[PDB]
Amino acid sequence: DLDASDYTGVSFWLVTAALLASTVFFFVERDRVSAKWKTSLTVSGLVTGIAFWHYMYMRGVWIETGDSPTVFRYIDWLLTVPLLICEFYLILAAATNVAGSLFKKLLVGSLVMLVFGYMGEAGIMAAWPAFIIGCLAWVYMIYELWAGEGKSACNTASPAVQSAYNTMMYIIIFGWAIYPVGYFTGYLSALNLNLIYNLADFVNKILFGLIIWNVAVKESSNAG
Amino acid sequence: DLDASDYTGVSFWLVTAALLASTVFFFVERDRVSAKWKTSLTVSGLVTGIAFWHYMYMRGVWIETGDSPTVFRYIDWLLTVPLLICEFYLILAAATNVAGSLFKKLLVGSLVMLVFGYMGEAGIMAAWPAFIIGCLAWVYMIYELWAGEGKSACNTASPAVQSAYNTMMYIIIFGWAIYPVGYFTGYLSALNLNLIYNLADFVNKILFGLIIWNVAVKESSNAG
Amino acid sequence: DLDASDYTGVSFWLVTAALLASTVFFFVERDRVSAKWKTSLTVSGLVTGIAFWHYMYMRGVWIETGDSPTVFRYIDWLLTVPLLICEFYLILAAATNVAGSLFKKLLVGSLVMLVFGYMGEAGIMAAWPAFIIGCLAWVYMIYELWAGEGKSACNTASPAVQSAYNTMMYIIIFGWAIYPVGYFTGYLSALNLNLIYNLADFVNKILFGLIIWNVAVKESSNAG
Amino acid sequence: DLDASDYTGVSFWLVTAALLASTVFFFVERDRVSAKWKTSLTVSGLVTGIAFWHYMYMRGVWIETGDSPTVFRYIDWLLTVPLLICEFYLILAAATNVAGSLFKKLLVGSLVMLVFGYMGEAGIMAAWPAFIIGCLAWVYMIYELWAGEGKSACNTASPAVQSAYNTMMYIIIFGWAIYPVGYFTGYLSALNLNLIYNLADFVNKILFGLIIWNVAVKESSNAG
Amino acid sequence: DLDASDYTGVSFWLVTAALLASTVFFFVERDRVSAKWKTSLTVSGLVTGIAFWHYMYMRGVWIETGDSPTVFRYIDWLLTVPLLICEFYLILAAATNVAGSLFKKLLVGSLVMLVFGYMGEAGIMAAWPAFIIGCLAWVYMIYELWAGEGKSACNTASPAVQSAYNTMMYIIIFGWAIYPVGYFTGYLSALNLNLIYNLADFVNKILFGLIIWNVAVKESSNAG
Ligand SMILES: CCCCCCCCCC(=O)O
Ligand SMILES: CCCCCCCCCC(=O)O
Ligand SMILES: CCCCCCCCCC(=O)O
Ligand SMILES: CCCCCCCCCC(=O)O
Ligand SMILES: CCCCCCCCCC(=O)O
């Protein structure tokens, strides 16, 4: 039985279980969605599925060592963040006709936020400059959602899709903002940084995928 | 081969097997249900699936240590109790048109019953005050089912759904009442408390999900 | 590589493999059956699935210890025998309209045959009285199938269902009779008792489920 | 990393991987086949699935010991050979109306070829008489395919099914002939016998199932 | 937590995760494709599924030993390269009517490129002659795609299929060219050779399968 002194150990176990439940939920709930939205729910399951597969290894590292598994942490982000950006393309493709140029601009900004974030936690370029650079890439992320191809594409979509797109954008706004909070807490320690990161994937990976499922089911029921 | 002296060890093994069978049953029996009820049977499978995944770890703790895995016990409840409350929303959504405000009132009451229950078993706020507080949150749970949005929503539903809603409410009445019985037995010991909790999840997690499956299949066959 | 001196070790391995193949067969062959019979093939897969999950543990006990895993044996029966009795209800429900009162009478008789059977193998109430009591509960089992609600329900069913019902009844007659044969052999030893029990689940769990699949496929093809 | 000196170790690993891929292929490719042929592709997956599950244990025995896992080898054949004979019945049932008396004659001949084959490799009845007896049962196998109920049933089938039936018969002719070649090589040693047996299951279990899939897909596309 | 000094260890972990995600994606995304293209997405899942199953063993070898798992590397190629060549046949079969003689010419050339490639890494026929011979078989591979049955078959296909066929041919051109680059780097060392091979399967096994999925989904949506 798990300890009750270290909240981080509880979070590693709690989150890991939630990502396993979410992965099964997303892959199974593709029956309720139309063939256009089936790809959107698959990518959500992959994000939670990869994150769960990465959290199992990270949970062992915490018990065996007690230090933050930074290398395992950022490798998972390097694989799941592009798939989350793909969700913006998929919903605008399963509802409207979008070429997808906004995908490239968001993907480049996301990679910059992750590449510099890993370097700061590894001692490269100290930590304060990394926090500023990671923030600026996050600032570029929010700007392209206010004005871009997606904003033009979201205008012609159904009101249900528009509400989802705004909610997903908010998640980029508030949810992705909590990562710099954990970065600030853990370097400006390790126990709180891992706790915040654990809770972050609860929102940015599970709540993000639940918004996709809700809009897909509403649209699919309309068609039947 | 399992011992025959400790009934708790038998129950840990017997329950764990039943939750694995129930998990496969719920995820597979989504073929017999309409697309509206497919989400209801998925959540039932998640509850049994998470509980099974938690009972495997708890079974090891009992053999390795011999003490009650309280931390593993309440973490599972913290994850499965909200999903069981979601079943009340889902059945009223797959049968009627419900906004779902009763979900919030039940969820808040359920969390209070679990947060204080864990503290009592950990020595926080003794045990007698925790039993009273946990009972009162359980008393609030039954009151909102007698009068609330669900009661208004259940009135307009089909007689098959109404029978299920009443049966689910009963399970809240009798089934959830057995947890304070185990709490009273184990602190007012460990062998009986774990035995009762094991048997409790047999009713509140498996019988609860079988009521959902029965009503979903009856409704789906009517539509075809 | 497995030994060639102890036929029991071969049977534990040979049966365990057959139950894994049967479990996959039953859960996969639900595509060929109508939505009414899909529940019948699920329960067959659960019986073989639980039995396989129990035979894996029993196989280890035999190699590690060399004694009969009685406690693991009867726990599996306590979980799978009710599901086999449920098959009588399901086929009469997927073919006719049956209330299901015969289910209670068979279930009570089955539990008596298992409760006293475990006690005899554990030294409770010796072994000779347990064999007589277990036989009488088995004698009550066959009487209710000759005359009962199922016999009334089987009359109105299709000739394909009637042939299956008679075949399933026979399995209760001959197949369930082999368990007292192993009980008599092992106490009136261990090597032969485990060998018979291993072969018994080959008929009463796999051949029983193949009869269900055959009748379900014949009926489903008629509807299309 | 695997050794490059012992070709048998490579074959055990190479075959085991092919049977896992074939098992997933057969169970997944049931979407492309009509409900009549879905049972035929299931049995092919069971044969490869059981063989894969048996090859994993045999691969360990080879590394741990270095001797031929004869007992594990023949137990797999005792379970998969009847299922391969069932393929002749299934294809003639999913294409024509066949009672299936040829199944009994082939099954009896197959069991004789396996029972005596195991005895020869265990020292019972030497090895030369076992090779002759095993050959004669194989000679009876080919005779009943030239003239029997299947030959009468294959006449009325579609030309696509007839080509498959002839190809399957050939596999009995050439493919099953390679087992006595390995038996002759290994006793008239162990390294070559295991290598031949490994390659034999590549043809008689995978190529056999690919013929079933090819004919099922051609027939299903005709119906749509 | 993984080391940050050896990029090869990161690549082994990063690739292995991508192949697991790709395998689930390909087998799940068969819902969005027509029954003609379902076989094409299955083979893509098998390639990534076998490669993932092989990368798990190779990752252990790298940590345990630190040397290149050449034998495990080429066995995976011996099993996955023919399946990738089968993709050219499948897409031309699910879109047009092709006999498939170009499959034999490409398969023979592919095997020559792999047989000689393994020998060079094992010291057989040195390394420089192996690089030249492996290049020539790769040169024969590109020539038959410019002129062959596939080029004749691709002419009559839809413009969507033609774009996919050209993209797949390019992957043969650029993607398969990176293997000799790693061969040249690692012998004309081990750290860079494994890194290149890891990245190679990211393109030639995942990007190759994503081209198949994209064209299958576009064609299936047209039919509905
Ligand atoms: C200032 C530090 C910024 C860190 C950003 C971390 C991004 C994580 C993205 C996500 O998990 O979906
Ligand atoms: C007075 C103690 C109350 C304890 C309540 C425990 C709640 C468990 C809920 C459930 O398992 O679904
Ligand atoms: C006289 C002893 C009777 C033993 C009965 C054992 C029942 C097993 C039931 C079954 O396996 O489905
Ligand atoms: C003369 C020896 C004959 C050996 C026959 C072995 C049969 C194997 C059948 C098969 O693997 O499908
Ligand atoms: C000159 C050396 C050529 C090496 C070719 C290796 C082929 C790998 C094929 C592939 O991975 O799909």
Residue numbers in the entry:
A (entry chain B), B (entry chain C), C (entry chain D), D (entry chain E), E (entry chain A): 23 to 210, 216 to 251
From the manuscript:
Microbial ion-pumping rhodopsins (MRs) are extensively studied retinal-binding membrane proteins. The green-light absorbing proteorhodopsin (GPR) was originally discovered in marine γ-proteobacteria as the first bacterial rhodopsin and as an example of a new type of bacterial phototrophy.
However, it is more slender and uniform compared to all-trans retinal, lacking the bulky density associated with the β-ionone ring. LC-MS scans from the enhanced product ion (EPI) mass spectra of N-hydroxydecanamide showed the specific ions at 188 m/z, 118 m/z and 104 m/z (recombined ions). This led to the identification of the unknown ligand as decanoic acid (capric acid) based on the detection of its hydroxylamine solvent reaction product N-hydroxydecanamide. Decanoate is non-covalently bound to PO, with its carboxylate group pointing towards the GPR Schiff base region and its acyl chain extending towards the extracellular end of TMH E. Instead of the retinal Schiff base, a salt bridge is formed through the engagement of the negatively charged carboxylate with the side chain of K232. However, significant shifts were observed in the extracellular halves of TMHs D-F. This conformational difference can likely be ascribed to the bulkiness of the β-ionone ring, which occupies more space than the slender acyl chain of decanoate.
